[PDB]
């Protein structure tokens with residue numbers, strides 16, 4: 373997160389860290405045994421880390437649970453990042469409380485102008501590199517589809533939306549990938565891609581979760 377603020381320990385209780393020896397992506401807890409992330413975060417040997425603030429210090433509210441199964445969307449295209457979403461089943465159910473909790477799936481798509489909360493452990497600079505150890509937060513509006521398509525001609529599909537600031541300075545970034553975009557208490561987006569971080573007229577692009585609710589519910593009911 374570039375241009376954000378320090379969330380505060382366990383104030384974003386659905387935020388997960390995906391770990392393969394080191395943090396490499398975020399994700400979102402959607403019930404006690406399933407996590408949603410970006411398909412471009414896929415790899416084998418994932419441990420899901422719940423209840424994290426400082427990802428380098430054991431502070432006492434962590435649950436570390438191995439993944440048992442990963443399901444990349446059947447139509448994921450790694451060249452265009454269309455359908456950039458995947459599901460991860462935990463080997464055991466997480467213990468849910470006020471500091472570890474699930475986030476609700478949406479019943480409708482959010483409109484341009486809605487304010488959302490984006491969070492993660494990714495890079496905090498737009499020219500340079502500095503990875504924080506504690507979770508960072510950003511409040512950002514969903515942008516109109518015409519501004520989104522004009523920022524990224526020929527690249528935005530119906531499964532994507534833009535959120536952020538056209539003036540730059542505030543954005544998600546590398547290492548935030550897979551993490552949540554939450555708007556009015558519902559998971560509306562997944563940190564997916566962008567050109568650089570926090571560049572003028574290059575807002576962040578997010579997977580539009582509302583298009584995937586039927587696939588998620590069906591997949592979970594059968595696996």
Ligand SMILES: O[C@@H]1[C@@H](O)[C@@H](O)OC[C@H]1O
Nearest residue numbers: 451452453524526527528
């Ligand atoms: O983001 C672009 C993607 O949509 C595709 O076209 O490959 C080239 C990239 O620049």
Ligand SMILES: O[C@@H]1[C@@H](O)[C@H](O)OC[C@H]1O
Nearest residue numbers: 487488489554555556557
């Ligand atoms: O859901 C809320 C979101 O819409 C807002 O942007 O940040 C605070 C959250 O509670």
Ligand SMILES: [Ca+2]
Nearest residue numbers: 426429430431
């Ligand atoms: Ca920790």
